[PDB]
Design a binder for this molecule. Sequence first.
Ligand SMILES: [Zn+2]
Lengths: 214, 166, 152, 108, 293
Amino acid sequence: KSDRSIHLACTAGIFDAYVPPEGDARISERMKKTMASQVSIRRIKDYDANFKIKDFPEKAKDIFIEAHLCLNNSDHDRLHTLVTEHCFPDMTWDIKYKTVRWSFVESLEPSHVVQVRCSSMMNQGNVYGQITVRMHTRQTLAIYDRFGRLMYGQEDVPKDVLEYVVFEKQLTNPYGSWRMHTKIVPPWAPPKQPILKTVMIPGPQLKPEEEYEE
Amino acid sequence: ISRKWEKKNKIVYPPQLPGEPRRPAEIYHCRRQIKYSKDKMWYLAKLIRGMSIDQALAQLEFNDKKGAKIIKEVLLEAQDMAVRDHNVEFRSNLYIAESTSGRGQCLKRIRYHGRGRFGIMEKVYCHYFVKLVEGPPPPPEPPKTAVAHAKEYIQQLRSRTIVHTL
Amino acid sequence: ISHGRVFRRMGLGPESRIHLLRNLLTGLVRHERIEAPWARVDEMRGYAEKLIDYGKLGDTNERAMRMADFWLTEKDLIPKLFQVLAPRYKDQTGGYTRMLQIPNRSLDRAKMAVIEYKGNCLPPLPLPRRDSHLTLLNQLLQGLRQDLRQSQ
Amino acid sequence: AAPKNRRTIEVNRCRRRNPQKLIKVKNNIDVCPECGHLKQKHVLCAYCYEKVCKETAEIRRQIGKQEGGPFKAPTIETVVLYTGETPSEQDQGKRIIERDRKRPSWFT
Amino acid sequence: QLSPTELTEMRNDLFNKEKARQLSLTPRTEKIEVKHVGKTDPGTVFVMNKNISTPYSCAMHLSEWYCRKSILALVDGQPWDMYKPLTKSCEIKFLTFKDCDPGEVNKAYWRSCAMMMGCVIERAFKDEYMVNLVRAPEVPVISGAFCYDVVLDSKLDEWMPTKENLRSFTKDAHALIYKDLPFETLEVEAKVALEIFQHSKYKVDFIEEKASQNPERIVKLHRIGDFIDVSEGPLIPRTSICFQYEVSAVHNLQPTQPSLIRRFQGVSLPVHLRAHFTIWDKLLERSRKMVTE
Ligand SMILES: [Zn+2]
């Protein structure tokens, strides 16, 4: 029952997550969702009156590109600087003993600020703001083994990608910044590129007294 | 103490050029502080040196030793970490490169003898070290042939020089 | 030198060997399938064949009654022997038991053996079965046997 | 009688790594095909025998439950019946032992 | 007229070009789902590469026991080679020599031994003399000797082989067994099959009949090293599966005109079913006896 409590700089959820509209990638209530977005916008503006939504998306793509370059060169300090504590471990622990070759080629269309949401005051005296941004870019990816053998992707071939990246800033923090919190992938998303190796999924392991049922 | 076997298991390599051999996978595993003698554990390791993973599992399953059971568990979980984390394709595509027993940290107990005499028991412990390499097991070295013996003798005879002169 | 010695030196003596084999035989008659060390199972297998011979000799015979009285220590198996087992093997001549090797005891690594009376109601043991007649060598030998039948 | 001198590690290695002291490789290991598990050619399969042992143990437990006490071994033969079948006309005067499971495929 | 070395080299070139054409027809990796429905290790799901992975690859995923004992594969109930690529999601079942009904495995072994004999024939006779290969008749297992029909030279209509010649055939076949070549399989169009075997009228007729019975006119070619032949079905993975081999007898068929057909008969037994010396001798004598289809 010590008076020192854990001082978190982020949350681990999305406040009213943007549900993906069907056919957004296939094609090359609005007033209510808009009005909620700008209610959250005047909350960010009140906590910091120097924020521009029209100026966000270039900073968002900058944060994304530099975070993935820090992922390329294993710069965990700058990755902490640009990436929230909820997004860091599911960024790094699947690549902890692997080599990742990532690059940014171009953007097909400019990124779009598509959702803005805010927290309540009660969150331990802290108020957080999240902004969801559509990105649709062309990237390259080549993840290597512990031994240097190739596992995923191709070295030179670029491919299209569409993500719903959600950034979060702690507004009450005097030194808070906009960092990547997560990314929504749609449930209707196209299936990912197949892996380069073969996988055996085992069946049930049967005790002697048990009989296999189909 | 030292845990360089685990650090060997977590060493990492640079990416591979597309015009060189595949550099087959290497998996390091060990069990520490096994209540068993390192000599008998050496006998079991020397039994399973150089075999395939399935062959080693068969021999350890049908051996009659507590160390055989322990090494079978170690090999099973080493194969599990092999095709779970080190990107080994087939779970049967492994062989034992290194199989070693080491001395553990033992304890001293008193052994009461006759008269007023005593001895010092050792509660002996041991480690087991294993290394798994992806690939078929390497072929055993063939025995030397009479042709090879004759060639070696003739090489010695032709390598003879006149000693202690110009 | 142990030339022509057909019996094993078991237990604490000859009396203890007989008592051990009697306990194993009583267990075999009660449960119809027991497991025990291999040597004891072999000796008690021989005694079980001879016990079924006495049971087929029958309950009205005083010698067979005395033999069953000695070799069955629980006294309910004597009706079970004389009116279950001998009626079961009345048709058969002398192959009353089945002995198979089961691998090793998990404590002292002892060579184990399961022994059952034939017939039973228990689930059958995973018996060693010969190769099917549809295998390659078996079809070649069947063709050979056919050709010899046509020849002679 | 005591050792006159200490035996060296070379002599000790020769003695302890003589090929008689080494563990011989077993050749009589084959896949039991009813379950795909390793067995020895002269030995019953451990997995199948273990299955048979647990089913037999449950049979004997039900026999004891019907039996109710020692020194009451029956005069009649016994059969085992599972769920979903009637006693056959050859199993008339035999003690029926009921089991609350489907009849295993390896049991006829 | 081309030399036999040139004919072999061009046939291997055509085989490799067609195989590369199929591998280019499947350029990108694609994941298929194979459900092992065998009695042992039941209901096991494999994620394999389309037109690249093999039943041998599935067995290597499972254990080396399946690799060493599995001879044929049931893919959706049809017999499949161990080294033949899988083309679709299916169910697999490995077949050994010692099953309840090993008849398909026996047929595959029998065809493989006949094809190896024909290779030994073709690379055994002399260059001044001509060798033409007719077919390997699908003779049943119970007959006792695998048979292979050869047209030999007009200068050799009168020549009968001797025991040393038969032992030389056996030694060449054992050299193949030692060499341990995999049985490469290719499902190929009839036009490419005719282009491969265009300098053999009997092979042309064989390919034409296979393309007639099959509506899409695809036939099966098999290769051990350099020798290519048209097969009647699935084959065993490797020549090292054969342990005991013998070229027992050579006979001449009844119609001498228009050409002399010579039936070469041998007998074999694999490693998993090797017989004793005396049993093998009796099988040798029955294989030396005539076999009619
Ligand atoms: Zn089994």
